[PDB]
């Protein structure tokens, strides 16, 4: 069938029933990097079972009056097992995703989210003079929230969370031109997407960079008649792809 | 608009039992679960537990273990707590809350509290 | 389980001053918030997940904090808000309550 997956990394496997394609990234799959692109000349460390495998994250609820959800991802997989602590170590490392993102509800059911990946998501203040602080940025394996109002500018530092403009002052239906997938209630139960490394330079530090952003937005809302089962949660597995290491140094 | 309506005042006698009941309107009911606390004349705040009203699923703290019952009645939205073997530390009153989920939706806390019911043992 | 130390116990101010109120946890903690109990009625949801200042909250009011330490800020203090600050978590672990950090002016 055309609605069943089995994907297996490391000593984990995921099953799914019913399903999409997977969506590759922009056409290319996640590979090693090369010698002809390469710049740091020690030898990079590759453990390749211990890192790739399927981490799972923090449930989230979805609410009625829910307006979304992001995550950063280099840094949701920061305290999670050998991948969090090779980025203690280390102070290059580069990687591709692939991020499974799962919710069902019966056939009496009804709403639709955007699963989104976006590269570089440069967030906006509330205060239009400073710049957000790390926590409201970012929480390592936990979800931070959109809303469906204004943050005022009276909090110094905070995300500008109005849901429409995606924290990014842009058109929220316009988030279409990254790789996505949709949850739509009625046909799907999940969605696929594996990311290449995208950057500007062929390693980072893991730590001051966050390189990709997953957004789950719910354009139609939750919905259903009284008697069925009013929680349902989403969850999020991430597994690294091709992950490796420079710059072995103490422990940060 | 969200209301918890709780019941009102009432005293018992050491070794006697109370039913506190606290009644909820403005929103559909069984979609958040209804969390009871406590609240000494002089002390903090402690948490006795919670009922989800969707199942009747029911959650204590272990202090509270053997002395406290929680139901509910989805038919006039009201959501009752017995209590049981009631001592000189039952000079309290007792708060009805509202969050939904334990922890996957507990973004919004416990947003909706009633107004608080004192009980007490004495002669 | 997790418990929630806060200090100070008793916090004095003048009116007109900006003021501190911390709470540190015994491990991580997925979700803190803060409630507001004037002597006489029931407590208030005020900041909740731990920036998100609840409708009718002045702009006076505002906290952060990440990991373990989390912190509730007064910019310039009012004469109206003496009362106690409550402080919960909501983590794997069952749930917990401060302490209550009380504030009466000076």
């Known amino acids: 069938s055309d609605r069943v997956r089995s994907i297996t990394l490391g000593n984990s496997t995921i099953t799914t029933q019913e399903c999409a394609n997977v969506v590759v990234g922009y056409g290319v799959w996640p590979e090693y990097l090369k010698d002809n692109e390469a710049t740091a000349e020690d030898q990079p460390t590759q453990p390749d079972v211990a890192t790739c495998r399927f981490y799972t994250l923090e449930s989230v609820q979805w609410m009625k009056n829910s307006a979304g959800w992001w995550w950063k991802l280099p840094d949701a997989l920061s305290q999670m097992g050998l991948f969090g602590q090779n980025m203690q170590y280390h102070y290059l490392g580069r990687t591709g995703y692939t991020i499974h993102v799962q919710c069902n509800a019966s056939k009496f059911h009804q709403g639709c989210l955007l699963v989104v990946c976006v590269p570089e998501a440069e967030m906006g203040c509330s205060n239009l003079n400073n710049t957000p602080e790390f926590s409201e940025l970012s929480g390592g394996d936990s979800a931070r929230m959109f809303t469906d109002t204004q943050v005022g500018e009276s909090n110094a530092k905070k995300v500008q969370t109005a849901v429409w403009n995606a924290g990014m002052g842009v058109g929220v239906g316009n988030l279409t031109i990254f790789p996505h997938q949709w949850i739509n209630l009625r046909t799907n139960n999940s969605a696929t997407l594996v990311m290449p490394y995208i950057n500007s330079v062929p390693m980072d530090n893991m730590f001051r960079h966050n390189n990709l952003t997953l957004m789950i937005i719910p354009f139609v809302p939750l919905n259903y008649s009284e008697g069925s089962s009013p929680y349902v949660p989403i969850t999020v597995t991430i597994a690294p792809m091709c992950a490796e290491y420079n710059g072995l140094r103490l422990a940060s | 608009e969200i209301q918890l309506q709780q019941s009102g005042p009432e005293l018992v006698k050491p070794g006697a039992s109370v039913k506190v009941s606290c009644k909820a309107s403005g929103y559909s009911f069984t979609d958040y679960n209804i969390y009871w606390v406590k609240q000494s004349h002089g002390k903090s705040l402690e948490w006795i537990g919670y009922?989800?009203?969707?199942?009747?699923?029911?959650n204590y703290n272990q202090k509270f273990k053997g002395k406290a019952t929680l139901t509910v009645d989805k038919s006039s939205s009201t959501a009752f707590m017995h209590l049981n073997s009631l001592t000189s530390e039952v000079s309290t009153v007792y708060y009805c809350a509202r969050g939904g989920g334990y922890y996957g939706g507990g973004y919004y806390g416990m947003d909706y509290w009633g107004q608080g019911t004192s009980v007490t043992v004495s002669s | 389980q997790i418990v929630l130390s806060q200090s100070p116990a008793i916090l004095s101010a003048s009116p007109g001053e900006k003021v501190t109120m911390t709470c540190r946890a015994s491990?991580?903690?997925?979700?803190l918030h803060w409630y507001q109990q004037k002597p006489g009625s029931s407590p208030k949801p005020w900041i909740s997940?731990?920036?998100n200042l609840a409708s009718g909250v002045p702009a006076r009011f505002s906290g952060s904090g990440s990991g373990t330490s989390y912190s509730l800020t007064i910019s310039r203090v009012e004469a109206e808000d003496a009362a106690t600050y409550y402080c919960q978590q909501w983590s794997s672990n069952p749930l917990s309550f401060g302490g209550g950090t009380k504030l009466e002016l000076k």
């Open positions: 491990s991580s903690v997925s979700y």
């Open positions: 009922v989800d009203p969707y199942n009747g699923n029911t």
């Open positions: 997940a731990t920036s």
